[PDB]
């Protein structure tokens, strides 16, 4: 039939079939298990960087993000050239990869399904205010929205504004969620 | 490549399937999902069989309907598999034998790619640039929404990388270029039909020209 899906084996079967490579000695012992790094090491670390920036005018992070991140030892795959973008009382930053899913893995963690969605990839570049609003984040009309499309090797993190009511908190500050680092959420005080 | 993957600005999609800070569950929602990335790194770092850019391009080369119906991690299973076949490391026969059924792959490339341009300009922060009004059938890291548009330099990278339009096809002539954070007004990109302020695109030097 017209426009129909190609017949395909279950994806689990196709993925494990590809893992053909192992039987040819092309995959080192413990290799994919080692990478499965993804679950434990790559982690929204980004919160630690934000809390440090908030309490240490380190806030180095905005001029040489790579150097700042390297101080914590958090450079890594898909996170080798880092730029932090600062929210201000007149500016809200948001990150996407419209072309695929590019994300600062080591400090944000692997991207979530929603960030990889065609909905986010298509819409946030053109209607970021509506997208954020739908997601539960109301950006005040007096604030400019700036969308960073991750199209090359720069990997971004948002430095969100520090909310009122957190004065004097300990680096407690690390209310900085994955969504805050991507730029779709604002840090919330309980 | 003006493929269906170039989604920025496409209209008609519904709501993003997420509300802020909602539980997104585990990193991997199935036992195979770590494989595409793991096996990509085997190919890139251990075998030296292809670049990360080739992985992006082979996914772009999925038949368009196939791309549109395939979940993210599955696209990379298909892409990495396709590269292993194209590079002569695996055969489709053995993949389908091991899978116990059909394992359709991405379509062959219709472009040999292009070299890094010899003639480019070193731009400075604050300079106005235009995105070269060029059409590239192979891999390119310029989303169509900025083609021929004018914006201002916010950043020039302090590192340089191979030109994707070359290394994405495994060519020997990708050289190295810095990239530029180019800031466009939302209205430069989408006229009156946007609710945004600005959009910053990270563009290779060879995609740009003085305004
Ligand atoms: Fe991406």
From Swiss-Prot, chain A:
Q: Gene3D superfamilies recorded for this chain? A: Nitrile hydratase alpha /Thiocyanate hydrolase gamma
The protein's UniProt keywords, in alphabetical order, are:
Iron, Lyase, Metal-binding, Oxidation
Residues the record lists as Cysteine sulfinic acid (-SO2H) modifications: 100
Modification after translation is described as: Oxidation on Cys-100 is essential for the activity. Oxidation on Cys-102 stabilizes the Fe-NO ligand coordinated in the inactive form.
Top enzyme class: lyase
Task: Report the activity regulation comment.
Answer: Inactivated by nitrosylation of the iron center in the dark and activated by photo-induced nitric oxide (NO) release. Inactivated by oxidation of Cys-102 to a sulfenic acid.
Enzyme Commission code: 4.2.1.84
The UniProt catalytic activity note for this protein reads: an aliphatic primary amide = an aliphatic nitrile + H2O
Gene Ontology molecular function, alphabetical: nitrile hydratase activity; transition metal ion binding
Sites where Cysteine sulfenic acid (-SOH) occurs are at 102
For activity, the cofactor(s) needed are: Fe(3+)
Q: So where does Fe(3+) get bound?
A: 97, 100-102
SUPFAM superfamilies to which the protein is assigned, alphabetical = Nitrile hydratase alpha chain
| Source taxon at top rank | Bacteria
Note describing how the cofactor binds: Binds 1 Fe(3+) ion per subunit.
Concerning its family, UniProt says:
Belongs to the nitrile hydratase subunit alpha family.
Q: Main role?
A: NHase catalyzes the hydration of various nitrile compounds to the corresponding amides. Industrial production of acrylamide is now being developed using some of the enzymes of this class.
The record's subunit annotation is: Heterodimer of an alpha and a beta chain.
Matching entries from NCBIfam families are given as: nitrile_alph
Q: Mind telling me what this protein is named?
A: Nitrile hydratase subunit alpha
- State the organism's lineage: Bacteria, Bacillati, Actinomycetota, Actinomycetes, Mycobacteriales
Q: Gene encoding this polypeptide?
A: nthA
Curated annotation (Swiss-Prot), chain B:
Recite the UniProt keywords alphabetically: Lyase
Biotechnology: applications noted: Industrial production of acrylamide is now being developed using some of these enzymes.
Q: Which domain of life is it from?
A: Bacteria
Catalytic activity, reaction form: an aliphatic primary amide = an aliphatic nitrile + H2O
Where in the sequence is the signal peptide annotated?
none
Classification via InterPro entries:
CN_hydtase_beta-like_N (IPR049054), CN_hydtase_beta_C (IPR042262), CN_hydtase_beta_dom_C (IPR024690), Elect_transpt_acc-like_dom_sf (IPR008990), Nitrile_hydratase_bsu (IPR003168)
Give the EC number: 4.2.1.84
Query: What GO MF terms are annotated?
Result: nitrile hydratase activity; transition metal ion binding
The UniProt entry's sequence similarity note says:
Belongs to the nitrile hydratase subunit beta family.
How does it associate, per the subunit comment? Heterodimer of an alpha and a beta chain.
Cited function: NHase catalyzes the hydration of various nitrile compounds to the corresponding amides.
Supply the name of the protein. Nitrile hydratase subunit beta
Organism of this sequence: Rhodococcus erythropolis
Its gene is nthB
């Amino acid at each position: 039939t017209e426009n129909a899906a190609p017949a395909q084996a279950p994806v689990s079967d196709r993925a494990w079939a590809l893992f053909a490579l192992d039987g040819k000695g092309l995959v080192p012992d413990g290799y994919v298990e080692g990478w499965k790094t993804f679950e434990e090491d790559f982690s929204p670390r980004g919160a630690e960087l934000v809390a440090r920036a908030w309490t240490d005018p380190f806030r180095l992070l905005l001029t040489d993000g790579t150097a700042a991140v390297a101080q914590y030892g958090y450079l890594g795959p898909q996170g080798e050239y880092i730029v932090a973008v600062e929210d201000t009382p007149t500016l809200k930053n948001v990150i996407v990869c419209s072309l695929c899913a590019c994300t600062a893995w080591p400090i944000l963690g692997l991207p979530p399904t929603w960030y990889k969605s065609f909905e986010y990839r298509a819409r946030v570049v053109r209607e970021p205010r509506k997208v954020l609003s739908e997601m539960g984040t109301e950006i005040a009309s007096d604030i400019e929205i700036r969308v960073y499309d991750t199209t090359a090797e720069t990997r971004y993190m948002v430095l969100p504004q520090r909310p009122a009511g957190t004065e004097g908190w300990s680096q407690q500050l690390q209310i900085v969620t994955k969504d805050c680092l991507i730029g779709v959420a604002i840090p919330q005080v309980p | 490549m003006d493929g269906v993957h170039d989604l920025a600005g496409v209209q008609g999609f519904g709501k993003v399937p997420h509300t802020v800070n909602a539980d997104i569950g585990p990193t991997f929602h199935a036992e195979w999902e770590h494989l595409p990335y793991s096996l990509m790194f085997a190919g890139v770092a251990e075998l030296g069989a292809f670049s990360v850019d080739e992985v992006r391009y082979v996914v772009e080369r999925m038949e368009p309907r196939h791309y549109m119906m395939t979940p993210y991690y599955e696209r990379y299973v298909i892409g990495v598999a396709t590269l292993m076949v194209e590079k002569g490391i695996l055969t489709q026969d053995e993949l389908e034998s091991l899978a116990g059924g059909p394992f359709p792959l991405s379509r062959p490339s219709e472009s040999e790619g292009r070299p890094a341009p010899v003639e480019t300009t070193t731009f400075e922060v604050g300079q106005r640039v235009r995105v070269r009004d060029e059409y590239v059938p192979g891999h390119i890291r310029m989303p169509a929404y900025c083609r021929g548009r004018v914006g201002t330099i916010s950043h020039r990278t302090t590192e340089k990388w191979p030109f994707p339009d070359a290394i994405g096809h495994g060519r020997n002539d990708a050289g190295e270029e810095p990239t530029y954070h180019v800031k466009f007004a939302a209205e430069e990109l989408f006229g009156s039909d946007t609710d945004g302020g600005s959009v910053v695109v990270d563009l290779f030097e060879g995609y740009l020209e003085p305004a």
